[PDB]
């Protein structure tokens with residue numbers, strides 16, 4: 570199936586900047602969530618999980634149809650906790666009922682990254698809601714207890730190469746693992762609602778110990794109180810991933826640029842943009858607008 574981007578009728582960059590801004594203002598306001606981490610990280614994860622169901626082989630799943638709104642997908646065990654991001658976005662969608670669900674979930678992620686001081690992420694509109702029976706089955710999102718070979722093979726289905734995978738994984742600077750959610754517990758670093766390359770620095774520089782958490786799963790823990798999942802740690806066990814980790818640990822701008830590309834790509838897999846579609850939008854942050 571071909572999913573052609575269809576611009577919400579009559580809308581242009583200013584309409585979407587207003588949605589951006591409403592997301593960004595609520596991110597600022599609703600600051601208590603998750604022990605004052607705020608909603609930035611879970612909105613980034615929502616954007617990723619709503620996009621990451623894509624299968625390049627048959628164009629099932631992906632961000633286009635906004636299918637997270639249907640119970641099979643919102644109740645995917647892999648999506649445990651993302652209901653908080655959805656509930657955050659609900660008043661946004663009520664204010665701007667014209668935006669499609671896929672456009673709102675993906676824009677939430679863009680807005681979160683940028684408001685967290687991350688790179689600009691160009692963003693295109695035009696996702697169109699598709700019906701309940703187009704919701705992908707559970708099981709397309711990745712397991713965390715696996716090795717580098719798993720990670721590499723997993724991400725081939727999303728058409729991501731080694732650099733794209735290592736760049737995307739840098740989003741694990743953000744937020745934390747929650748035991749009751751994923752069976753893993755702890756943050757990956759200190760700056761977990763500011764977008765930086767800390768994930769790579771911590772991978773290389775902390776003294777990691779392989780421990781079992783209280784759900785009886787193994788994770789890597791440091792004396793600083795940080796953790797890494799087995800799939801995170803695989804990025805320094807595999808020598809190809811390791812080289813790239815070192816690159817991003819040593820060049821924040823390169824990480825920003827490569828993350829931006831990979832994240833836009835993730836959010837756009839599966840979508841065909843007509844030749845005469847609008848160019849991608851680059852939204853101004855609240856700070857840049859003086860708001």
Ligand code: HEM
Nearest residue numbers: 610611614617711712713737740744745746747750751800
């Ligand atoms: C091999 C791939 C990946 C695996 C196995 C994985 C696994 C996990 C797990 C287990 C959690 C913790 C969930 C919880 O307990 O709340 C998590 C959190 C998170 N992941 Fe991933 N992840 C992967 C890739 C990504 C990518 C590609 C992104 C986005 C670019 C991403 C963004 C996030 C964010 C932002 C959080 C924190 C959520 C929060 O604080 O609520 N992850 N991930």
